[PDB]
């Protein structure tokens, strides 16, 4: 069943929001109380009748107004920005999930939401527990990539191609490196997709993982785009542990000497921010980083446990010369939607 909804907002649910006081502080009129009839866009809490679900051009205008203004503003707290845009993008995804109409423009609505998820996989990492909850974000991202993977098969069997097909298959490979089944998947791609520019980049990243070649990993992440770099922030705690274990094994004589390993090379191979992050990272693991150089000892190294909180790795956000809005769109923006 197709809908005839012709509004940016819900037509009934804003009044229930205003009576029951569940408003979002970003989209109200200034001076509380009244709901903003210009922008009180849909909340997610069979789907009956042609309200609460929108056809494709109104929903595309909704996505355009979401990308041109809402994600750029820094007004208000950072707690509810991710909740606001995440709930509304998940509402759009639930809307066109059970609508069962497909088009290449509908694939772009998946594309912008998964680009928003890739961008928020790194930007909101410093948020304290209750605000971000990175487990449900990484849970939500793989449903988007799985639905996009199963979606691209349907138009390919139909006989129409897409310019943005081979891009996110690379991100699909970069999502799952610890699962070794995905190599069977890269034997089952289309030859034009497999012989492209960025899937062979993903093969280089998978070879950098399993061969434990950390030199051609951090030098590889500087030769990629912004989203490709910030998706690899999940593996920084894995590569820097699987790399330093060999470097605290291959430099000692038996178990009882000390190999004086100098500074400014560990930050050259392993991608740190500076000396200040590196000394704090290697002090907590159990080895000595004090005075002139880094100590190395077999017996005084143990596996970590408990808190393993991360930071923002600086070098990956240097490649953000354009602003936050045009990354998830791709190139320019359509201006003034009304």
């Amino acid at each position: 069943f197709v809908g005839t909804c012709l509004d940016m907002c819900p037509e009934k649910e804003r009044y229930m929001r205003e009576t029951r006081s569940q408003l979002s502080v970003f989209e109200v009129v200034p001076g509380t109380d009244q709901v903003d009839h210009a922008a009180a866009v849909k909340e997610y809490s069979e789907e009956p009748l042609p309200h609460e679900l929108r056809p494709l051009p109104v929903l595309s205008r909704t996505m355009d107004y979401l990308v041109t203004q809402i994600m750029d503003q820094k007004e208000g707290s950072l707690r509810d920005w991710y909740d606001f845009v995440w709930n509304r993008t998940r509402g759009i995804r639930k809307d066109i999930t059970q609508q069962h109409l497909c088009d290449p423009l509908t694939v772009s609505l998946i594309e912008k939401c998964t680009r928003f998820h890739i961008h928020c996989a790194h930007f909101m990492c410093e948020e304290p527990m209750s605000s971000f909850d990175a487990k449900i974000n990484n849970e939500n991202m793989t449903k988007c990539l799985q639905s996009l993977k199963e979606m691209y098969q349907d138009l390919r069997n139909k006989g129409v191609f897409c310019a943005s097909e081979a891009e996110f298959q690379g991100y699909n490979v970069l999502l799952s490196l610890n699962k070794g089944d995905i190599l069977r998947e890269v034997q089952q791609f289309h030859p034009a997709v497999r012989n492209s520019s960025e899937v062979k980049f993903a093969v280089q990243a998978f070879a950098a993982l399993n061969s434990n070649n950390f030199v051609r990993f951090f030098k590889l992440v500087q030769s990629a785009s912004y989203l490709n770099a910030c998706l690899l922030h999940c593996y920084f705690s894995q590569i820097r542990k699987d790399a330093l274990r060999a470097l605290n094994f291959a430099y000692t004589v038996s178990t009882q000497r000390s190999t004086i390993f100098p500074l400014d090379g560990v930050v050259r191979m392993l991608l740190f921010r500076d000396c200040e992050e590196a000394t704090d990272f290697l002090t907590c693991h159990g080895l000595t980083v004090s005075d002139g150089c880094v100590e190395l000892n077999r017996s005084a190294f143990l596996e970590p446990e408990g808190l393993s909180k991360t930071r923002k790795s600086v070098f990956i956000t240097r490649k953000l010369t354009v602003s936050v809005g045009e990354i998830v769109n791709g190139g320019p923006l359509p201006p003034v939607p009304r």
């Binding site: 089944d181 190599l183 069977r184 070649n213 950390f214 060999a246 291959a250 390993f261 100098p262």
Partner: protein, 364 residues
């Protein structure tokens, strides 16, 4: 001609015969519900009426009706086989209901293959329950060989673990039909080459390569195609004579390239062959052992205990592999040290690798 079929299914139940399955139910020979429901009991005759209607459906080439037929066949025979009270004689009839819903279950074009997977998993969850002679689990190894064959073509083998551990712990593990015993650890060796369990694949599929019938000369080749890189990663590489006799000549120059870039040229000369069988990304992981053999060619060419890293840098620089510098060659050698291929330690103050002198580096 119907009365002879009713007589031979009547003697099937009366004489508790196992050859009556191959007589009637199997699709290997030349192949109306109210009549059988008049003459026989319902769980024993719905089989025959469904079989007539879907041999009619195959006779004018309709596959969806035959798929619903064999769904009804497996469900009704499961109900009648639980309505048996512990006997062995319906286990030949168990053979021709699962195999025939593999080729009719594959041809409906996926989700129908997953549908056949769950309705055949429902068969296994009832077959594996009850029970030394009267045991209904003798055909179970026949059943579990199908559940790999559906699961491999769909490429949705995310969890196959409780399906394997249930039959790995068994008292009758070393005694079944030996035709189905080969066909099991072939697929276990497939799941053991994948996710990095290369020793289990080697033992469980070298057991398949040492056995199996010489009459079908496709099984021996198909074992080799998926056998060879298991023992190239393990180390014990084939000879020239088996590749000459079984006409498998693509890997042979590759077995030169492991022995002493020649490896990239040999891989790219037949680039379209290993993609088709799904070997190509496994074969890239031999970079470690070919660099260790290149380490052997450097060590025997210069003959000292402490070697400088610039010679290995030049030896990688001939290879035309992109973006190789002094930090990359220092990294692979420490990986060789940690995994145990090359003994010694990488000195940073002198940039020389001191190796052990009694054994230089262990064999495999």
């Amino acid at each position: 001609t119907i009365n002879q079929y009713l007589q031979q299914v009547y003697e099937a139940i009366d004489s508790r015969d196992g050859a009556s399955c191959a007589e009637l139910v199997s699709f290997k020979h030349p192949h109306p519900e109210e009549k059988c429901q008049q003459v026989l009991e319902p769980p024993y005759d719905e089989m025959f009426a469904a079989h007539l209607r879907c041999t009619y459906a195959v006779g004018n080439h309709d596959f969806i009706e035959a798929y619903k037929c064999q769904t009804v066949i497996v469900q009704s025979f499961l109900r009648a086989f639980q309505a048996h009270k512990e006997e062995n004689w319906a286990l030949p009839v168990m053979y021709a209901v699962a195999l025939d819903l593999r080729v009719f279950a594959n041809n409906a074009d996926g989700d129908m293959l997953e549908k056949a997977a769950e309705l055949l998993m429902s068969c296994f969850r009832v077959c594996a329950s009850d029970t030394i002679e009267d045991s209904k689990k003798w055909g179970m190894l026949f059943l579990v060989n199908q559940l790999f064959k559906i699961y491999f073509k769909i490429n949705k083998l995310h969890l196959c673990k409780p399906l394997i551990r249930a039959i790995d712990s068994s008292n009758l593990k070393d005694d079944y039909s030996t035709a189905q015993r080969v066909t099991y650890k072939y697929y276990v060796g497939r799941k053991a080459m994948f996710d990095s369990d290369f020793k289990q694949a080697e033992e469980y599929l070298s057991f398949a390569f040492e056995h199996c019938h010489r009459s079908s000369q496709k099984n021996k080749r198909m074992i080799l195609i998926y056998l060879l890189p298991v023992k190239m990663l393990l180390g014990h590489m084939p000879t020239v004579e088996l590749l000459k006799k079984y006409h498998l000549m693509q890997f042979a120059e590759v077995t030169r390239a492991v022995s002493e870039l020649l490896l990239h040229e040999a891989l790219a000369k037949h680039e379209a062959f290993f993609i088709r069988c799904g070997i190509f990304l496994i074969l890239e992981k031999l970079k470690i052992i070919t660099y260790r053999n290149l380490f052997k060619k450097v060590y025997l060419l210069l003959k000292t205990h402490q070697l400088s890293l610039d010679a290995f840098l030049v030896a990688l620089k001939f290879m035309q592999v992109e973006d190789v510098d002094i930090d990359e060659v220092q990294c692979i050698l420490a990986n060789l040290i940690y995994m145990g291929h090359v003994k010694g330690y990488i000195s940073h103050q002198h940039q020389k690798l001191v190796v052990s002198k009694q054994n230089p580096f262990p064999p495999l």
